[PDB]
Amino acid sequence: GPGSMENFQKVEKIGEGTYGVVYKARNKLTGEVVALKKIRLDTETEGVPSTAIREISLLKELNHPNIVKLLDVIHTENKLYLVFEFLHQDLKKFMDASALTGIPLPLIKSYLFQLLQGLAFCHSHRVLHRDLKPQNLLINTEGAIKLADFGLARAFGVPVRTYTHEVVTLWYRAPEILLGCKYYSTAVDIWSLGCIFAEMVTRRALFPGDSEIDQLFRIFRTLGTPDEVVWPGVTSMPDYKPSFPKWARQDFSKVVPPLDEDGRSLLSQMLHYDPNKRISAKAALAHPFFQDVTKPVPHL
Amino acid sequence: GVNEVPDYHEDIHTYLREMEVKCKPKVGYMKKQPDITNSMRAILVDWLVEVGEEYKLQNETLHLAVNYIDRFLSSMSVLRGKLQLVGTAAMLLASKFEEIYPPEVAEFVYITDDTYTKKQVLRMEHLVLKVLAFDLAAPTINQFLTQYFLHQQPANCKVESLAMFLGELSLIDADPYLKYLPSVIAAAAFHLALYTVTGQSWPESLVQKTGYTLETLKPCLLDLHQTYLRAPQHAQQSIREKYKNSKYHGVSLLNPPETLNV
Ligand SMILES: O=C(O)c1ccc(Br)cc1O
Ligand SMILES: O=C(O)c1ccc(Br)cc1O
Ligand SMILES: O=C(O)c1ccc(Br)cc1O
Ligand SMILES: O=C(O)c1ccc(Br)cc1O
Ligand SMILES: O=C(O)c1ccc(Br)cc1O
Ligand SMILES: O=C(O)c1ccc(Br)cc1O
Numbered sequence A: 001g002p003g004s005m006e007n008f009q010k011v012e013k014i015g016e017g018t019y020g021v022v023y024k025a026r027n028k029l030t031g032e033v034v035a036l037k038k039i040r041l042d043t044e045t046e047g048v049p050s051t052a053i054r055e056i057s058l059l060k061e062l063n064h065p066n067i068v069k070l071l072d073v074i075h076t077e078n079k080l081y082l083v084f085e086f087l088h089q090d091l092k093k094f095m096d097a098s099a100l101t102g103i104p105l106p107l108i109k110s111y112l113f114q115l116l117q118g119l120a121f122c123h124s125h126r127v128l129h130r131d132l133k134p135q136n137l138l139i140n141t142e143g144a145i146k147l148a149d150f151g152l153a154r155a156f157g158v159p160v161r162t163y164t165h166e167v168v169t170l171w172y173r174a175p176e177i178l179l180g181c182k183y184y185s186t187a188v189d190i191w192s193l194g195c196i197f198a199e200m201v202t203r204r205a206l207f208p209g210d211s212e213i214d215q216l217f218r219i220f221r222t223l224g225t226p227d228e229v230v231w232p233g234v235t236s237m238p239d240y241k242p243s244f245p246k247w248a249r250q251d252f253s254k255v256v257p258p259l260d261e262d263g264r265s266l267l268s269q270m271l272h273y274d275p276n277k278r279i280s281a282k283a284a285l286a287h288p289f290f291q292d293v294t295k296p297v298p299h300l
Numbered sequence B: 001g002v003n004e005v006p007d008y009h010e011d012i013h014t015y016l017r018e019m020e021v022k023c024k025p026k027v028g029y030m031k032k033q034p035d036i037t038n039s040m041r042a043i044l045v046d047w048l049v050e051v052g053e054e055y056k057l058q059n060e061t062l063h064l065a066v067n068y069i070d071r072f073l074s075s076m077s078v079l080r081g082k083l084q085l086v087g088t089a090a091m092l093l094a095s096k097f098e099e100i101y102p103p104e105v106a107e108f109v110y111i112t113d114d115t116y117t118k119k120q121v122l123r124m125e126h127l128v129l130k131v132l133a134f135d136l137a138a139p140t141i142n143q144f145l146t147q148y149f150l151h152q153q154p155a156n157c158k159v160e161s162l163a164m165f166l167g168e169l170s171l172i173d174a175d176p177y178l179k180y181l182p183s184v185i186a187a188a189a190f191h192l193a194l195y196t197v198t199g200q201s202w203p204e205s206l207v208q209k210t211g212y213t214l215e216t217l218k219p220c221l222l223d224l225h226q227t228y229l230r231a232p233q234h235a236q237q238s239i240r241e242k243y244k245n246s247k248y249h250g251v252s253l254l255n256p257p258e259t260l261n262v
Helices: A050-061 A091-097 A105-124 A187-202 A212-223 A261-270 B009-022 B038-055 B059-073 B080-098 B105-111 B118-131 B141-149 B157-172 B182-198 B204-210 B214-233 B238-242
Strands: A008-017 A020-027 A033-040 A070-075 A079-085 A137-139 A145-147
Touching: A008 A033, A050 A070, A050 A079, A050 B080, A070 B118, A091 A137, A091 A187, A105 A137, A105 A145, A105 A187, A105 B009, A187 A261, B009 B141, B009 B182, B009 B204, B038 B059, B038 B080, B038 B105, B038 B157, B038 B238, B059 B080, B059 B118, B059 B141, B059 B157, B080 B105, B080 B118, B105 B118, B141 B157, B141 B182, B157 B182, B157 B214, B157 B238, B182 B204, B182 B214
Parallel strands: none
Antiparallel strands: A008 A020, A020 A033, A033 A079, A070 A079, A137 A145
């Protein structure tokens, strides 16, 4: 687009992603701080990676305050530079930094509200994120949180077709993916955000499995093993097994003890087994939990 | 209903309606192309259909590729000996966008019978991405069709398959189809398929959704009706052959209606 690498000053490494390394850089003419994501095509024998083709094409169309902004793509014959707006930290680092303080509830509530705004915008624009986890959520000094890393995102059709199985980092992966369902939809992103909600409150992952089966068993032990009543069709699903242990559903008051009635209500609707009953990001915006929501700066 | 995204299907439809106008090719591009013609484009698209069948690509992939080709050809003058290079790179980009398992680049070189090198395919890939500025998430005929299919009372596989065949037929013939939007060809194809199979018409419910009436679809419908009647005689036959397959309910074997009463 309207860019060149001579006008950028490298500041420091900030990360490494699917394409190599992300740098913090500074536009020497405007002062703007950016993140550069270098996509080496010289080390590419299949030309431009499909990950990059999706990331760029999808991010171009997603203009929203709670989605990271792709400012430009600089095309060289051997190299591709993605220029993003710079954000200071990811939510994972912020949670670790908030270790023994806790994250104050106003900030959890603000962050969840913004994440829902961002995700609703994705889903309204036929985009599934498919890798929502705290490492992929970026925060600034002004109180904003934004969806980032669209490297696994995909443009969907209505109704959805079969897409890539085994998307979503394991701890954030929805039961319908774990059970090998032919179809998944926008409900997978809500499941991830639900796990993230719980994690913002406790500072630890809700379902930290070591395997697909251990992941599922962890979910089952918290929310109860799903049957045909809670989730019609579950017993038919490709990787459903009748030998699965049948754990009783525990009271959600014990799943995240510090959460108030409203919080619990919302969390429960995000973590509903049945993808059809799980709350949408659009509808979640109206949940009573957000009645008193504000947008405070981070505390650190 | 989550597979049909109830909370988002209207937002999505509205958004595709906006995007289809932005992703539209220049209706008269072929007149400004000195060395290629509607006829050569027909040959290319027909080939892409075969390639899609050969590698078991989604239909959506084929439609994306055609979108990429017509938009590139809208701003880039191309010699006839390079038309197939544009097409191959278009199919490669579409595959990486849309497919779980795109074919390797080598396979794309292979299907061109070593007319082009791997280096040429990849160089063209970059060129196409530069000209389109990575605007690859284009609305297709298929993306509208699959939403319209939700309005059937009840769902009918033959109606669905016949609508896809008809929409695919439109990809072949830049004249007249370049002048219609994906959402309008999809509407024509859906009405025509529904009429052929069940005798029914474009439903009220889709008038509500799209704003389109049989009145507004009439011109496109008259084109599509003629394409359907003439399809057995068309120089390009790959789509008819494809839609003989049981995967698509053999719908190319159905007889077009002689008249529409429209
Ligand atoms: O200035 C450069 O040449 C440069 C190169 C690579 C990256 Br990532 C950032 C840069 O700023
Ligand atoms: O992946 C991204 O979109 C991204 C954007 C900005 C920063 Br800072 C880090 C990232 O990883
Ligand atoms: O795949 C596994 O390793 C596995 C282990 C235990 C059970 Br019960 C089901 C499984 O699928
Ligand atoms: O020469 C032709 O008529 C021709 C037609 C289609 C393609 Br693709 C390349 C060609 O060279
Ligand atoms: O030369 C031809 O007629 C021809 C036909 C089809 C294709 Br695809 C490429 C061609 O070059
Ligand atoms: O390819 C381009 O020119 C381009 C320009 C700007 C942005 Br944001 C994304 C792009 O892909």
